[PDB]
Amino acid sequence: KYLPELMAEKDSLDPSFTHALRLVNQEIEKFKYIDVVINKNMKLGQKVLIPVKQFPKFNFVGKLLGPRGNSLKRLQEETLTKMSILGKGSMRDKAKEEELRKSGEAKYFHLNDDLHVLIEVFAPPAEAYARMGHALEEIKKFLIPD
Amino acid sequence: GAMEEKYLPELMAEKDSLDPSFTHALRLVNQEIEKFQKEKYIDVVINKNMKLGQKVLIPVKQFPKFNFVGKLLGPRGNSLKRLQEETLTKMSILGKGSMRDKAKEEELRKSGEAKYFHLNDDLHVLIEVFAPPAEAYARMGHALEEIKKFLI
RNA sequence: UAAU
RNA sequence: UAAU
């Protein structure tokens, strides 16, 4: 009974209610402890603020990515993590970025957030926490100007 | 944060202009406004102490009466004290099976019911670390390696 | 093996 | 410096 009401609203809501539509679709689409013997891969995620407020003119994203992205790819490979630069100011063109933000797609919803690096690890527990610790130490050398 | 600068006003403007016959969308917009108006992001310039906790299952079902709790603690609890000190964690044995006497162990999360609902969950070890971020993850990984030696 |  |  409840999902058919949600779908009627999805279909009848005016497009300009981008946030309501997102919350409705999200609600529609909705239709543990670590066991150390079998030691299965677990997901760890951690967001790290880029200190833009305190360094408003430093080019953190450009330093993080490098030419053609190669600096961030090499840092990903040598830390065995995935790193995503997300949040306000994470794109090159701020006017383009703002239009994507306004589109309401979940793919661009992170643009409402503060500029951060999302570090994600998938590994057995002891190794996942170790990897994340090493990634945090290396990522400092990029986020703190010198 | 950029949420309080543009997301929240936007939510607010939608809630004010939504036709209230959309009772689900209006409900969900209102709940989302509520969620935002009431921990996750590392500030790596300040690098302040951060909390990390991880619960580690004691594998009672595969090993139904190997005495894990006894091996973890040792005499007067010294072996668990060693392990916390060497890893720089706090470690708490919790779940069902945690207390020495099974009889009362049932009654304590009947009635009273303030601090003891960890006795509705499986038996497990809670590992807690408090340290700057890179060190805190490093410490948890080390405590996870060290503690395997007690769960096999 | 019974700790905080 | 613009990756995913």
CSV table of C-alpha atoms (C1' of nucleotides) in Angstrom, one decimal:
chain,number,residue,atom,x,y,z
A,1,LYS,CA,0.0,0.0,0.0
A,2,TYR,CA,2.8,2.4,0.8
A,3,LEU,CA,5.1,2.0,-2.2
A,4,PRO,CA,2.3,2.7,-4.7
A,5,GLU,CA,1.6,6.0,-2.9
A,6,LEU,CA,5.3,6.8,-3.1
A,7,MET,CA,5.4,6.1,-6.8
A,8,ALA,CA,2.3,8.2,-7.5
A,9,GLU,CA,4.1,11.1,-5.8
A,10,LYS,CA,7.4,10.4,-7.7
A,11,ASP,CA,5.4,10.6,-10.9
A,12,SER,CA,3.3,13.7,-10.0
A,13,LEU,CA,5.9,15.9,-8.1
A,14,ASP,CA,7.0,18.9,-10.1
A,15,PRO,CA,10.6,18.5,-11.3
A,16,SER,CA,11.7,21.7,-9.5
A,17,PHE,CA,11.4,19.8,-6.1
A,18,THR,CA,14.8,18.3,-6.5
A,19,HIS,CA,15.4,17.5,-2.9
A,20,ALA,CA,11.9,16.1,-2.2
A,21,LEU,CA,12.2,13.9,-5.3
A,22,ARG,CA,15.6,12.6,-4.1
A,23,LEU,CA,14.1,11.7,-0.7
A,24,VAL,CA,11.1,10.0,-2.3
A,25,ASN,CA,13.3,7.9,-4.7
A,26,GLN,CA,15.6,7.1,-1.8
A,27,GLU,CA,12.6,5.9,0.2
A,28,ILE,CA,11.3,3.9,-2.8
A,29,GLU,CA,14.6,2.2,-3.4
A,30,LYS,CA,14.6,0.8,0.1
A,31,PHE,CA,12.3,-2.0,-1.2
A,32,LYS,CA,27.8,-6.4,12.2
A,33,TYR,CA,30.6,-7.9,14.4
A,34,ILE,CA,34.1,-8.7,13.1
A,35,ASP,CA,34.8,-12.5,13.1
A,36,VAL,CA,38.6,-12.8,13.2
A,37,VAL,CA,39.0,-16.5,12.4
A,38,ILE,CA,37.6,-16.4,8.9
A,39,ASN,CA,39.1,-12.9,8.5
A,40,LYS,CA,36.9,-11.7,5.6
A,41,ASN,CA,37.4,-8.4,3.8
A,42,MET,CA,35.7,-5.5,5.5
A,43,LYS,CA,35.0,-1.9,4.2
A,44,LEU,CA,36.5,1.1,6.1
A,45,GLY,CA,35.7,4.6,5.1
A,46,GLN,CA,37.1,7.9,6.5
A,47,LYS,CA,36.5,11.5,5.4
A,48,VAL,CA,39.4,14.0,5.8
A,49,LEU,CA,38.7,17.7,5.6
A,50,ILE,CA,40.7,19.8,3.2
A,51,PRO,CA,41.5,22.9,5.3
A,52,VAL,CA,40.2,25.4,2.8
A,53,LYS,CA,38.9,27.8,5.5
A,54,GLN,CA,42.2,28.3,7.0
A,55,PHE,CA,44.1,28.2,3.7
A,56,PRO,CA,41.5,29.8,1.3
A,57,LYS,CA,43.9,30.3,-1.6
A,58,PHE,CA,46.1,27.2,-1.6
A,59,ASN,CA,45.5,24.8,-4.4
A,60,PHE,CA,45.0,21.6,-2.4
A,61,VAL,CA,43.1,19.7,-5.1
A,62,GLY,CA,45.6,20.5,-7.8
A,63,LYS,CA,48.4,19.3,-5.4
A,64,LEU,CA,46.5,16.2,-4.6
A,65,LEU,CA,45.7,15.2,-8.1
A,66,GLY,CA,49.0,16.0,-9.9
A,67,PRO,CA,49.5,16.0,-13.7
A,68,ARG,CA,46.7,13.9,-15.3
A,69,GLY,CA,45.8,12.6,-11.9
A,70,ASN,CA,49.0,10.6,-11.6
A,71,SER,CA,49.9,11.9,-8.1
A,72,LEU,CA,46.6,10.7,-6.5
A,73,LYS,CA,46.7,7.4,-8.5
A,74,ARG,CA,50.2,6.7,-7.2
A,75,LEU,CA,49.2,7.5,-3.7
A,76,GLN,CA,46.2,5.2,-4.1
A,77,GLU,CA,48.4,2.4,-5.4
A,78,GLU,CA,51.1,2.8,-2.7
A,79,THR,CA,48.6,3.0,0.1
A,80,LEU,CA,46.2,0.2,-1.2
A,81,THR,CA,43.2,2.6,-0.8
A,82,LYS,CA,40.7,4.3,-3.0
A,83,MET,CA,40.6,8.2,-2.5
A,84,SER,CA,37.8,10.4,-3.8
A,85,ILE,CA,38.0,14.2,-3.7
A,86,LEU,CA,34.4,15.2,-2.9
A,87,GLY,CA,32.4,18.2,-1.7
A,88,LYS,CA,32.1,21.9,-2.5
A,89,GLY,CA,35.0,23.0,-4.6
A,90,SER,CA,36.1,19.5,-5.6
A,91,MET,CA,35.5,20.3,-9.3
A,92,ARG,CA,37.6,22.5,-11.6
A,93,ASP,CA,34.8,24.8,-12.7
A,94,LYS,CA,32.8,26.3,-9.9
A,95,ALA,CA,29.8,27.4,-12.0
A,96,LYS,CA,29.6,24.0,-13.7
A,97,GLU,CA,29.9,22.4,-10.2
A,98,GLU,CA,27.0,24.5,-8.9
A,99,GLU,CA,24.6,23.4,-11.8
A,100,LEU,CA,25.5,19.8,-11.1
A,101,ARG,CA,24.8,20.3,-7.4
A,102,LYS,CA,21.3,21.8,-8.3
A,103,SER,CA,20.5,18.8,-10.5
A,104,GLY,CA,19.6,16.7,-7.4
A,105,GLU,CA,21.1,13.5,-8.7
A,106,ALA,CA,22.5,11.4,-5.9
A,107,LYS,CA,25.7,11.2,-7.9
A,108,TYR,CA,26.3,14.9,-7.3
A,109,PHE,CA,24.7,15.1,-3.8
A,110,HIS,CA,28.2,15.2,-2.2
A,111,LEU,CA,28.6,18.7,-3.7
A,112,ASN,CA,26.5,20.0,-0.8
A,113,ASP,CA,29.2,19.0,1.5
A,114,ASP,CA,32.5,20.5,2.7
A,115,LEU,CA,35.6,19.7,0.6
A,116,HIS,CA,37.1,16.4,1.7
A,117,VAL,CA,39.0,13.4,0.7
A,118,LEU,CA,37.1,10.1,1.2
A,119,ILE,CA,39.6,7.3,1.9
A,120,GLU,CA,38.1,3.8,1.5
A,121,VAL,CA,39.7,0.5,2.2
A,122,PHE,CA,38.5,-3.1,1.5
A,123,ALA,CA,40.7,-5.7,3.3
A,124,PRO,CA,40.7,-8.1,6.3
A,125,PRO,CA,40.3,-6.2,9.5
A,126,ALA,CA,43.8,-5.9,10.9
A,127,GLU,CA,45.1,-5.0,7.5
A,128,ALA,CA,42.2,-2.6,6.7
A,129,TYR,CA,42.9,-0.5,9.8
A,130,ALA,CA,46.6,-0.6,9.2
A,131,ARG,CA,46.1,0.5,5.6
A,132,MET,CA,43.9,3.4,6.6
A,133,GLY,CA,46.4,4.5,9.2
A,134,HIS,CA,49.2,4.6,6.6
A,135,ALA,CA,46.9,6.5,4.2
A,136,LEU,CA,46.1,9.1,6.8
A,137,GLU,CA,49.9,9.7,7.5
A,138,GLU,CA,50.7,10.1,3.8
A,139,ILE,CA,47.7,12.3,3.0
A,140,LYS,CA,49.0,14.9,5.5
A,141,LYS,CA,52.0,15.7,3.2
A,142,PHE,CA,49.4,17.0,0.7
A,143,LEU,CA,46.9,18.7,3.0
A,144,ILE,CA,49.3,20.7,5.1
A,145,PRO,CA,51.1,23.4,3.0
A,146,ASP,CA,54.8,23.9,3.5
B,1,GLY,CA,29.4,23.9,6.6
B,2,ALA,CA,28.1,24.2,3.0
B,3,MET,CA,25.0,22.2,4.2
B,4,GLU,CA,23.9,25.0,6.5
B,5,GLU,CA,24.6,27.6,3.7
B,6,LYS,CA,22.6,26.1,0.8
B,7,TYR,CA,21.2,22.6,1.3
B,8,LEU,CA,19.1,23.5,4.4
B,9,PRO,CA,17.6,26.8,2.9
B,10,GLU,CA,16.8,24.7,-0.2
B,11,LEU,CA,15.1,22.0,1.9
B,12,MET,CA,13.2,24.8,3.8
B,13,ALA,CA,12.0,26.5,0.6
B,14,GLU,CA,10.7,23.1,-0.7
B,15,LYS,CA,8.9,22.4,2.5
B,16,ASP,CA,7.2,25.9,2.4
B,17,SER,CA,6.0,25.5,-1.2
B,18,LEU,CA,5.2,21.7,-1.3
B,19,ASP,CA,1.4,21.1,-1.8
B,20,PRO,CA,0.7,19.3,1.5
B,21,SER,CA,-1.4,16.6,-0.3
B,22,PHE,CA,2.1,15.1,-1.0
B,23,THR,CA,2.1,13.8,2.6
B,24,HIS,CA,5.0,11.4,2.0
B,25,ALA,CA,7.4,13.9,0.4
B,26,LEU,CA,6.4,16.6,3.0
B,27,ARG,CA,7.0,14.0,5.8
B,28,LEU,CA,10.4,13.0,4.3
B,29,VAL,CA,11.5,16.6,3.7
B,30,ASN,CA,10.5,17.5,7.3
B,31,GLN,CA,12.4,14.5,8.7
B,32,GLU,CA,15.5,15.4,6.7
B,33,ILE,CA,15.4,19.0,8.0
B,34,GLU,CA,15.2,17.6,11.5
B,35,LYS,CA,18.1,15.2,10.9
B,36,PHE,CA,20.4,18.0,9.8
B,37,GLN,CA,19.4,20.4,12.6
B,38,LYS,CA,20.5,17.9,15.4
B,39,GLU,CA,31.7,11.5,14.3
B,40,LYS,CA,33.0,11.6,10.8
B,41,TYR,CA,35.4,14.3,9.5
B,42,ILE,CA,39.1,14.4,10.3
B,43,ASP,CA,40.7,17.8,10.8
B,44,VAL,CA,44.3,16.9,10.0
B,45,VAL,CA,45.8,20.3,10.7
B,46,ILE,CA,44.7,20.2,14.4
B,47,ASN,CA,45.1,16.4,14.5
B,48,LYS,CA,43.2,15.9,17.7
B,49,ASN,CA,42.5,12.7,19.5
B,50,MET,CA,39.8,10.6,17.9
B,51,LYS,CA,37.7,7.7,19.2
B,52,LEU,CA,37.6,4.4,17.3
B,53,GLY,CA,35.7,1.3,18.5
B,54,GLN,CA,35.5,-2.1,16.9
B,55,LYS,CA,33.5,-5.1,18.2
B,56,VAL,CA,35.2,-8.5,17.7
B,57,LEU,CA,33.0,-11.6,17.7
B,58,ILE,CA,34.1,-14.4,20.1
B,59,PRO,CA,33.5,-17.5,17.8
B,60,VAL,CA,31.4,-19.5,20.3
B,61,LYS,CA,29.3,-21.2,17.7
B,62,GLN,CA,32.2,-22.8,15.8
B,63,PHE,CA,34.0,-23.6,19.0
B,64,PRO,CA,31.0,-24.3,21.4
B,65,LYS,CA,32.9,-24.8,24.6
B,66,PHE,CA,36.4,-23.9,24.2
B,67,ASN,CA,36.8,-21.4,27.2
B,68,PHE,CA,37.6,-18.1,25.4
B,69,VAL,CA,36.6,-15.8,28.2
B,70,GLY,CA,39.0,-17.7,30.6
B,71,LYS,CA,41.9,-17.6,28.0
B,72,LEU,CA,41.4,-13.9,27.3
B,73,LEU,CA,41.5,-12.9,31.0
B,74,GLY,CA,44.0,-15.3,32.7
B,75,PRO,CA,44.6,-15.3,36.4
B,76,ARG,CA,43.2,-12.2,38.2
B,77,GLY,CA,42.7,-10.8,34.7
B,78,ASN,CA,46.4,-10.3,34.0
B,79,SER,CA,46.6,-11.7,30.4
B,80,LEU,CA,44.0,-9.2,29.2
B,81,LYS,CA,45.8,-6.4,31.1
B,82,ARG,CA,49.0,-7.3,29.3
B,83,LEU,CA,47.2,-7.1,26.0
B,84,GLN,CA,45.5,-3.7,26.5
B,85,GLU,CA,48.8,-2.3,27.7
B,86,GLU,CA,50.8,-3.6,24.8
B,87,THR,CA,48.3,-2.5,22.2
B,88,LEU,CA,47.3,0.7,24.0
B,89,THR,CA,43.6,-0.1,23.8
B,90,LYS,CA,40.7,-0.7,26.2
B,91,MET,CA,39.0,-4.1,25.8
B,92,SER,CA,35.7,-5.2,27.3
B,93,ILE,CA,34.3,-8.7,27.3
B,94,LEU,CA,30.5,-8.3,26.7
B,95,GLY,CA,27.6,-10.2,25.3
B,96,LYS,CA,26.0,-13.4,26.7
B,97,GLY,CA,28.6,-15.6,28.3
B,98,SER,CA,30.5,-12.6,29.6
B,99,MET,CA,29.8,-13.0,33.3
B,100,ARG,CA,31.1,-15.8,35.5
B,101,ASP,CA,27.7,-17.0,36.8
B,102,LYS,CA,25.0,-17.7,34.2
B,103,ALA,CA,22.1,-17.7,36.7
B,104,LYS,CA,21.8,-14.0,37.6
B,105,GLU,CA,23.5,-13.0,34.3
B,106,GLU,CA,20.0,-13.3,32.8
B,107,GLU,CA,18.3,-11.1,35.4
B,108,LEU,CA,20.5,-8.0,35.0
B,109,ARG,CA,19.0,-6.9,31.7
B,110,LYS,CA,15.6,-7.7,33.0
B,111,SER,CA,14.0,-4.9,35.0
B,112,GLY,CA,16.9,-2.6,35.9
B,113,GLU,CA,17.8,-2.0,32.3
B,114,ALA,CA,20.3,1.0,32.3
B,115,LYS,CA,23.8,-0.2,31.3
B,116,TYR,CA,23.3,-3.9,30.5
B,117,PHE,CA,21.7,-4.4,27.2
B,118,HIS,CA,25.0,-5.7,25.9
B,119,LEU,CA,23.6,-8.9,27.4
B,120,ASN,CA,21.1,-9.3,24.5
B,121,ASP,CA,24.0,-9.5,21.9
B,122,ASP,CA,26.4,-12.2,21.0
B,123,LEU,CA,29.6,-12.6,23.1
B,124,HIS,CA,32.3,-10.3,21.9
B,125,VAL,CA,35.2,-8.0,22.7
B,126,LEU,CA,34.9,-4.3,22.3
B,127,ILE,CA,38.2,-2.7,21.4
B,128,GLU,CA,38.4,1.1,22.0
B,129,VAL,CA,41.3,3.4,21.0
B,130,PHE,CA,41.7,7.1,21.7
B,131,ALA,CA,44.5,8.8,19.7
B,132,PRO,CA,45.2,11.1,16.8
B,133,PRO,CA,43.8,9.6,13.6
B,134,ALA,CA,46.7,7.9,11.8
B,135,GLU,CA,47.9,6.5,15.2
B,136,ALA,CA,44.3,5.4,16.1
B,137,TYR,CA,43.8,3.3,13.0
B,138,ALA,CA,47.3,2.0,13.4
B,139,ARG,CA,46.6,1.0,17.0
B,140,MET,CA,43.3,-0.7,16.1
B,141,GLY,CA,44.9,-2.8,13.4
B,142,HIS,CA,47.6,-3.9,15.8
B,143,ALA,CA,45.1,-4.8,18.5
B,144,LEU,CA,43.2,-6.9,15.9
B,145,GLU,CA,46.3,-8.8,15.0
B,146,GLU,CA,47.3,-9.3,18.6
B,147,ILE,CA,43.9,-10.5,19.7
B,148,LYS,CA,43.6,-13.3,17.1
B,149,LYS,CA,46.1,-15.2,19.2
B,150,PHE,CA,43.4,-15.5,21.8
B,151,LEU,CA,40.5,-16.5,19.7
B,152,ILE,CA,41.9,-19.6,18.0
C,1,U,C1',42.0,-18.7,34.4
C,2,A,C1',37.0,-13.7,35.6
C,3,A,C1',39.5,-8.2,34.4
C,4,U,C1',37.6,-2.7,33.7
D,1,U,C1',48.4,20.0,-11.8
D,2,A,C1',41.7,17.6,-12.4
D,3,A,C1',41.7,11.6,-11.1
D,4,U,C1',37.4,8.4,-9.7
